[PDB]
Amino acid sequence: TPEVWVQVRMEATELSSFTIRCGFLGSGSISLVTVSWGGPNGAGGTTLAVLHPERGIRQWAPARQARWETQSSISLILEGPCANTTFCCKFASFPEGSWEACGSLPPS
Amino acid sequence: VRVQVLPEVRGQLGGTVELPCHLLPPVPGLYISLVTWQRPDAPANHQNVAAFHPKMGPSFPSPKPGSERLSFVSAKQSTGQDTEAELQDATLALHGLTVEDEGNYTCEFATFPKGSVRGMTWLRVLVPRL
Numbered sequence: 001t002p003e004v005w006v007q008v009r010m011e012a013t014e015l016s017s018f019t020i021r022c023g024f025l026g027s028g029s030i031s032l033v034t035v036s037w038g039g040p041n042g043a044g045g046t047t048l049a050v051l052h053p054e055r056g057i058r059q060w061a062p063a064r065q066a067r068w069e070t071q072s073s074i075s076l077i078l079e080g081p082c083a084n085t086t087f088c089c090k091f092a093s094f095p096e097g098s099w100e101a102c103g104s105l106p107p108s
Numbered sequence: 109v110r111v112q113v114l115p116e117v118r119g120q121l122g123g124t125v126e127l128p129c130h131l132l133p134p135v136p137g138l139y140i141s142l143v144t145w146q147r148p149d150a151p152a153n154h155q156n157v158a159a160f161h162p163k164m165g166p167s168f169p170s171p172k173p174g175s176e177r178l179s180f181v182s183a184k185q186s187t188g189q190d191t192e193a194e195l196q197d198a199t200l201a202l203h204g205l206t207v208e209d210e211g212n213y214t215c216e217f218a219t220f221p222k223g224s225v226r227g228m229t230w231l232r233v234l235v236p237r238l
């Protein structure tokens with residue numbers, strides 16, 4: 001079964017940078033990635049980023065950086081966010097369909 | 109934009125019915141990257157029942173109800189660099205309705221740059237004398 005992983009971390013000693021990461025382990029190429037903070041994409045969450053493999057990257061506040069990563073995955077950086085905030089990543093892939101998972105900052 | 113779907117669709121057992129789904133209104137610059145039909149209440153390996161790619165056409169990954177009983181009514185894939193694909197009418201058709209087909213169906217458009225836009229429809233299978 002296809003699986004979507006989501007990881008959000010503070011990867012700097014300055015402790016002022018949220019890093020959102022998510023990827024898709026499937027059998028087809030990605031047609032679109034939608035990233036939302038607070039809930040599922042198009043179902044309560046606030047749209048943060050939309051990524052298309054050819055048409056480019058689309059991002060909204062407070063996304064300072066949204067980019068593709070290797071092996072069917074992406075990364076996102078927030079400006080400045082709370083530790084209990086949930087970030088959801090939905091991958092639309094042919095021919096297997098759409099798949100979504102959510103994650104949050106792990107406890108200290 | 110919005111997804112136009114009917115709240116409920118009624119079909120006869122063993123018959124054929126259509127689940128309307130449209131992305132309205134037409135917006136220049138809005139690109140539909142993929143259409144996904146899901147049975148969100150069916151197990152994880154059975155949720156994704158139908159998908160349509162602008163170039164490669166349709167797919168039906170879940171065996172239930174499977175490609176033998178599902179079809180896209182009006183979705184047309186692209187025919188080269190000349191003609192653009194037409195995915196705005198994502199109406200799905202079910203053939204040979206069974207009682208297993210009753211329930212929720214979601215129609216989602218993976219759009220650029222807007223994102224995921226989805227609507228839901230409940231399919232009611234009418235059993236004779238019932």
Ligand SMILES: *[C@@H]1O[C@H](CO)[C@@H](O)[C@H](O)[C@H]1NC(C)=O
Nearest residue numbers: 081082083084085086104105
């Ligand atoms: C999340 O954490 C912040 C700061 O600790 C707090 O103000 C807020 O109430 C929390 N939200 C929930 C839903 O607990």
